Design a protein around this ligand. Structure first.
Ligand SMILES: CCCCCCCCCCCCCCCCCC(=O)OC[C@H](COP(=O)(O)OCCN)OC(=O)CCCCCCCCCCCCCCCCC
Ligand SMILES: CCCCCCCCCCCCCCCCCC(=O)OC[C@H](COP(=O)(O)OCCN)OC(=O)CCCCCCCCCCCCCCCCC
Ligand SMILES: CCCCCCCCCCCCCCCCCC(=O)OC[C@H](COP(=O)(O)OCCN)OC(=O)CCCCCCCCCCCCCCCCC
Ligand SMILES: CCCCCCCCCCCCCCCCCC(=O)OC[C@H](COP(=O)(O)OCCN)OC(=O)CCCCCCCCCCCCCCCCC
Ligand SMILES: CC(C)CCC[C@@H](C)[C@H]1CC[C@H]2[C@@H]3CC=C4C[C@@H](O)CC[C@]4(C)[C@H]3CC[C@]12C
Ligand SMILES: CC(C)CCC[C@@H](C)[C@H]1CC[C@H]2[C@@H]3CC=C4C[C@@H](O)CC[C@]4(C)[C@H]3CC[C@]12C
Ligand SMILES: CC(C)CCC[C@@H](C)[C@H]1CC[C@H]2[C@@H]3CC=C4C[C@@H](O)CC[C@]4(C)[C@H]3CC[C@]12C
Ligand SMILES: CC(C)CCC[C@@H](C)[C@H]1CC[C@H]2[C@@H]3CC=C4C[C@@H](O)CC[C@]4(C)[C@H]3CC[C@]12C
Ligand SMILES: CC(C)CCC[C@@H](C)[C@H]1CC[C@H]2[C@@H]3CC=C4C[C@@H](O)CC[C@]4(C)[C@H]3CC[C@]12C
Ligand SMILES: CC(C)CCC[C@@H](C)[C@H]1CC[C@H]2[C@@H]3CC=C4C[C@@H](O)CC[C@]4(C)[C@H]3CC[C@]12C
Ligand SMILES: CC(C)CCC[C@@H](C)[C@H]1CC[C@H]2[C@@H]3CC=C4C[C@@H](O)CC[C@]4(C)[C@H]3CC[C@]12C
Ligand SMILES: CC(C)CCC[C@@H](C)[C@H]1CC[C@H]2[C@@H]3CC=C4C[C@@H](O)CC[C@]4(C)[C@H]3CC[C@]12C
Ligand SMILES: CCCCCCCCCCCCCC
Ligand SMILES: CCCCCCCCCCCCCC
Ligand SMILES: CCCCCCCCCCCCCC
Ligand SMILES: CCCCCCCCCCCCCC
Ligand SMILES: CCCCCCCCCCCCCC
Ligand SMILES: CCCCCCCCCCCCCC
Ligand SMILES: O=C(O)CCC(=O)C(=O)O
Ligand SMILES: O=C(O)CCC(=O)C(=O)O
Ligand code: NA
Ligand code: NA
Lengths: 513, 513
């Protein structure tokens, strides 16, 4: 029956067009079953979810679907849905991306990575720790994909230098290779959750909060950092121990140290541009953290309340990158008339920034925000909350555990951003129905959607690591089961112990009722 | 006194930083003179105008200044100013840019250009006409910069083929060269005004109308086209006659025909992707035109009023480019099990679109819209209208003439988009003060800001043409004086004769009072 296999291959080869054409027909009964506006909004949301999961269209292109569907269906006029795509959360994201582009332009990230690798050591467990701490720190500010793609060649070079009764020794070599190659994407995913700009789903949560709960303002850069950074550190430590036990065995060292010092020296001396970019990045982080950390007064109290935000601070800081000189200025240049008068190069030109900023992710976040606005305005949120009646008796902690497990095992097959975009309105409505703080369910879902460790399709970093060829699918699956379990447990601990104090989750807020 | 010249050169070399640092100090008295909110808004507007004119910052970076300045100054909170950057006008612009990227990806624009050049002829006056008609048609959908940059090499090749008592013949050769090289940017600038998506200032007018006059909806793709296309044709004819008289003398022909047929044949046969892109472009134009042309009922009357717009149609049409196959589909492929199962290439991937869309111009338009919103909300518009009291006795036609002349002679030194962004609120307030329709002053300013012909700095197409080296500054100045005069006269004629019927300019609208 080779004809069946041939037909299956033909169907799989044209899977994108088939899914694209047949998803609206399959979702058509949703419109008929539900009330008109809510049914049409749910149809749009489900269509976009299926398109994102199956990759029938580019993620940015699928994110543009509200623009078409909401006005034709009467859910939302164009002049309303279109500006949801540049809410201030997207400007915070854009400022973070511009700062990351400036950092990568001058190889500051590589210098920091190599310095940390020098500091931690060369011993095998110490080396997996070094790699994990480097990737998690660089994923806090750069994207997970960029951090993984930059750190993988360094790991490959170090492993080649290290490895440049035979069955035993070869087994240990291969296990060390697999451990090094699997510790990078996991640490990138873990570290992306520590900051709002670290990964897109955090900004999805921030932007969709404005639509579902416009009066909520307790989630900002400082509060999210003080909540997630200890959780990120605990999860990174647990993952490092798990990987070192599983794979790491918990003159080669000299060779690895030599290759690390080669790659650090190849960067040359620290340029003035690198120092300026680092100082601007430190100012960026400090001013984002200290604007309104909610436990001590911030510098936003010196201005009009309700006017400033993290986006304004980010844009103001990244504006300096476009005019600050990349060469060391000197007052003698004015006095010396014989010096050349070539115009100085700024720290970042707009050409490089534009060619390095992922505008697709910006449009994806905008599509998520517009879908949240359409769900709120069409009344689909009220209908969803009405449908969540049988779950109103679930204990809140058990509810957190179940939603975290469901989102973690659903993000293993789809993009984290799309997963959180689809699942966040459900979490908000469930929290409203459960007489509990909306953040108490929304934050764990946002954090857990980034807990994608089992499959190459789960996150782009996983695919980049799998492209190396030293990792099997079974290896990532068996590591990711326990990674997901530890992440779920630690997320529940964080949500029940110190998120309560940070976000005032103990009482139902006035803006949620 | 060579020290003075040396110091002047030092100052000019560091002009960007000097302007950037000293403009706020020079504009500081504006805050003190005016009332607080209006003074701060005017300070922001003047700072952005100076930065745009002097190029102290990249245009997109300067467009981000409202994000910083309005919240710190209390003019507008971040959650309000940031979404002004993705009003639906920017999505119409983005759809136009994506369609232009799809057109340029498959060399459809080059095929159309070469076909038109074949059709018009090879005779010198006929050849300047051909060039002008090609560049003006391609500037209607592509950007002026892109059209000029694509059409200049073709003109260079044709001139080289043509030229590949000696003083007389050399004079005629040089004049023909100058005429061909000057007819391209002028025609690109003229043709950019025919459509809303042809050039950014039209979209600036459309977006700022939403802020100044939210209830105005008579300006759309169809109405703007039926207003500007006859005006564009008349101005193109006048410019062609002027250039042919000034420079064109109003076996070389065989050689030029041979090189044109070489460059047409080098494109190969018409691909299926080219045909699909052309059909999608025709659908794009027709559906934009027929949505609500205001003289015959459109297809928007079949849906909810006030929900659809040109942006929705544009996004819906350009969405097809991202999944429609670039190769001819066949039903035999399913039946033939031995055919390869390689996935088909879409007409446009998001990678190419992202690397070809000018996101800087999108951010510039957004900055213009945000500045318009800040001017309206801060009360600066009311103050400006109060300051325009002595001009209330000027006849409306004379007012149109004066504003067109002022804007035309001001855009000769700065970007058209920045010029229209700065001048449009003044035009709206002057129209309000003058008891006349706001469009009667706003449209001529928007059209005339694109009438930049005298200097290389006026428009990027002028700079690209000047980079060839065959054009002198005096040549462009002497051509552009009469080009500007004819443009002003034709714009006044259009505003006083047939714009009145198209836009109902004869009476003060209810949404303006
Ligand atoms: C790998 C390929 C792609 C795979 C798919 C990826 C995307 C899909 C993700 C999972 C599926 C989505 C959720 C389940 C299907 C959609 C929900 C549904 O069936 O809604 C309609 C249904 C009608 O119920 P009704 O008859 O109204 O109940 C009696 C009272 N009227 O309503 C109900 O049954 C009531 C309960 C509704 C619960 C919430 C439904 C919406 C959840 C998502 C919101 C966003
Ligand atoms: C906001 C205030 C202003 C900014 C912060 C204060 C000023 C910091 C100094 C200016 C910048 C110096 C350049 C930093 C480059 C990136 C870090 C790096 O890789 O530095 C390595 C270098 C030491 O090694 P090196 O000398 O390069 O090589 C030979 C070693 N035997 O390192 C050095 O030489 C100096 C290392 C400095 C380490 C700084 C640690 C963090 C300081 C607080 C950050 C707060 C925000 C965090 C987010
Ligand atoms: C090449 C390098 C760059 C060159 C510069 C490029 C950008 C600048 C473009 C031209 C200059 C801008 C317009 C003129 C300067 C700004 C206007 C001004 O001076 O405003 C303050 C002034 C105060 O008038 P006041 O004392 O209030 O009058 C008595 C009643 N109170 O107000 C008045 O005098 C009253 C009349 C105001 C008329 C409109 C002013 C605003 C026009 C632009 C709005 C946008
Ligand atoms: C919305 C309805 C669907 C779309 C419009 C109707 C279908 C049009 C046909 C499908 C597309 C065909 C390919 C067009 C490519 C771009 C034009 C071009 O350069 O065509 C050249 C070609 C003739 O020359 P060729 O055969 O290539 O070379 C040897 C000549 N001896 O030309 C040809 O072979 C055909 C030329 C067709 C000319 C069409 C003119 C405009 C039609 C109305 C457009 C309305 C919207 C305008 C905006
Ligand atoms: C697109 C894929 C992956 C998901 C499944 C989509 C389709 C098959 C699903 C989604 C929602 C479903 C509908 C949900 C509710 C009802 C109401 C009742 O009359 C039972 C059938 C009916 C009408 C379902 C029919 C099947 C349905 C339309
Ligand atoms: C500018 C940064 C990067 C480096 C300089 C030092 C930092 C730590 C300084 C600069 C400005 C300072 C703020 C200025 C004003 C206030 C308001 C006051 O009621 C509480 C302290 C607070 C909020 C300060 C905190 C510390 C602060 C943020
Ligand atoms: C702050 C106010 C008062 C004065 C500003 C002076 C600025 C414009 C001056 C001071 C020092 C100068 C720099 C000194 C040296 C060089 C190296 C050479 O390649 C020329 C450009 C460059 C990079 C100069 C650019 C202009 C510069 C930055
Ligand atoms: C990696 C593992 C071992 C660490 C996390 C352990 C988990 C299962 C533990 C640690 C902290 C615990 C929570 C601490 C406090 C409360 C509040 C109480 O009123 C109900 C139980 C609840 C909600 C606990 C649920 C279980 C919990 C989340
Ligand atoms: C930046 C360059 C190109 C344009 C000129 C900017 C400066 C020099 C201009 C712009 C607006 C001007 C002010 C406009 C109005 C007044 C009120 C009155 O008291 C006269 C002086 C004063 C206070 C002017 C001082 C000079 C001023 C601040
Ligand atoms: C789809 C396009 C590109 C090609 C097909 C032909 C075009 C010209 C057709 C397709 C749909 C048509 C529209 C369908 C419905 C209406 C409403 C009616 O009250 C007036 C005519 C009007 C507004 C039609 C005008 C012509 C139209 C736009
Ligand atoms: C409309 C519904 C019912 C059926 C859709 C069938 C689609 C998916 C089929 C029909 C024709 C097919 C194409 C036929 C031939 C080729 C050339 C070869 O390189 C394989 C891919 C490609 C480009 C196929 C892609 C898939 C395709 C477009
Ligand atoms: C290239 C040149 C020759 C063509 C344009 C000529 C200009 C100067 C002419 C042609 C049409 C004319 C307008 C036609 C109608 C009116 C309405 C009338 O109540 C006042 C004069 C006014 C407003 C005219 C002003 C001058 C005008 C704009
Ligand atoms: C090709 C991707 C978009 C498909 C949109 C289909 C919309 C169908 C709507 C059906 C329900 C409303 C009928 C009036
Ligand atoms: C009740 C008013 C709206 C009726 C039509 C709703 C469905 C419109 C679907 C349009 C699809 C357009 C795809 C490009
Ligand atoms: C030895 C290093 C000397 C130079 C240190 C300062 C580098 C540039 C810092 C720029 C900071 C800008 C803040 C707005
Ligand atoms: C570097 C570009 C931005 C400069 C902004 C300067 C703002 C100054 C405001 C002064 C008036 C208000 C004082 C309270
Ligand atoms: C009256 C309330 C506001 C007072 C301050 C206004 C000026 C603020 C200027 C901030 C400049 C920031 C540059 C990054
Ligand atoms: C000889 C040419 C045969 C093919 C003509 C059609 C090309 C593709 C047209 C696609 C139109 C899509 C409309 C949504
Ligand atoms: O945004 C990132 O850091 C990349 C990872 C991500 O969000 C995804 O998997 O979609
Ligand atoms: O948008 C264009 O077509 C380019 C020309 C323009 O707008 C400008 O000169 O700024
Ligand atoms: Na990251
Ligand atoms: Na154009």
């Amino acid at each position: 029956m080779a004809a069946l296999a041939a037909a299956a291959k033909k169907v799989w080869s044209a899977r994108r067009l088939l899914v694209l054409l047949f998803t609206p027909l399959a979702l058509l009964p949703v419109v008929f079953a539900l009330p008109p506006k809510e049914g049409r909004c749910l149809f749009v949301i489900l269509l976009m979810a299926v398109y994102w999961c199956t990759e029938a269209l580019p993620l940015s292109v699928t994110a543009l679907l509200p623009i078409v569907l909401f006005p034709f269906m009467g859910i939302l006029p164009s002049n309303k849905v279109c500006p949801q795509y540049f809410l201030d959360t997207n400007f915070l994201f854009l400022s973070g991306l511009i700062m990351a582009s400036a950092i990568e332009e001058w190889n500051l990230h590589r210098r920091i990575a190599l310095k940390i690798l020098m500091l931690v050591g060369v011993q095998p467990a110490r080396l997996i720790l070094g790699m994990m701490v480097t990737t998690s720190f660089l994923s806090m500010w750069l994207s997970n994909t960029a951090s993984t793609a930059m750190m993988l060649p360094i790991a490959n070079a170090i492993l080649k230098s290290l490895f440049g009764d035979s069955r035993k020794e070869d087994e240990y070599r291969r296990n060390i290779w697999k451990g090094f190659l699997i510790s990078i994407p996991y640490s990138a995913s873990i570290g992306g959750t520590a900051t709002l700009t670290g990964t897109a789903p955090n900004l999805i949560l921030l932007g969709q909060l404005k639509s579902f709960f416009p009066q909520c303002d307790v989630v900002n850069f400082g509060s999210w950092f003080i909540f997630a950074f200890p959780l990120m550190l605990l999860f990174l430590l647990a993952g490092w121990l798990w990987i070192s036990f599983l794979y790491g065995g918990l003159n080669a060292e000299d060779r690895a140290r030599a290759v690390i010092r080669e790659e650090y020296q190849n960067l040359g001396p620290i340029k003035f541009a690198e120092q300026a970019v680092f100082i601007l990045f430190c100012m960026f982080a400090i001013l984002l953290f200290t604007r309104d950390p909610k436990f001590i007064p911030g510098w936003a109290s010196l201005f009009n309340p309700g006017f400033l935000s993290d986006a304004v601070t980010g844009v103001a800081i990244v504006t300096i990158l476009f005019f600050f000189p990349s060469q060391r200025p000197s007052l003698k240049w004015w006095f010396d008339f014989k010096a050349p008068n070539t115009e100085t190069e700024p720290l970042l030109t707009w050409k490089k920034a534009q060619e390095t900023v992922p505008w697709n992710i910006i449009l994806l976040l905008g599509g998520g925000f517009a879908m949240a606005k359409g769900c709120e305005e069409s009344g689909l949120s009220v209908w969803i909350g009405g449908q969540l009646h049988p779950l109103e008796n679930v204990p809140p902690a058990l509810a957190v555990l179940l939603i975290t497990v469901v989102i973690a095992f659903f993000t293993e097959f789809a993009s984290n951003t799309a997963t959180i975009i689809i699942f966040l309105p459900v979490l908000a409505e469930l929290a409203i129905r459960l007489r509990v703080h909306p953040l108490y369910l929304m934050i764990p879902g946002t954090v857990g959607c980034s807990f994608a460790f089992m499959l190459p399709v789960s996150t782009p970093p996983n695919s980049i690591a799998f492209a190396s060829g030293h990792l099997l699918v079974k290896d990532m699956v068996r590591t990711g089961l326990l990674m997901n379990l530890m992440g779920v447990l630690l997320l529940s601990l964080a949500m029940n112990t110190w998120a309560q104090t940070i976000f005032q989750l103990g009482t139902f807020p006035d803006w949620a009722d």
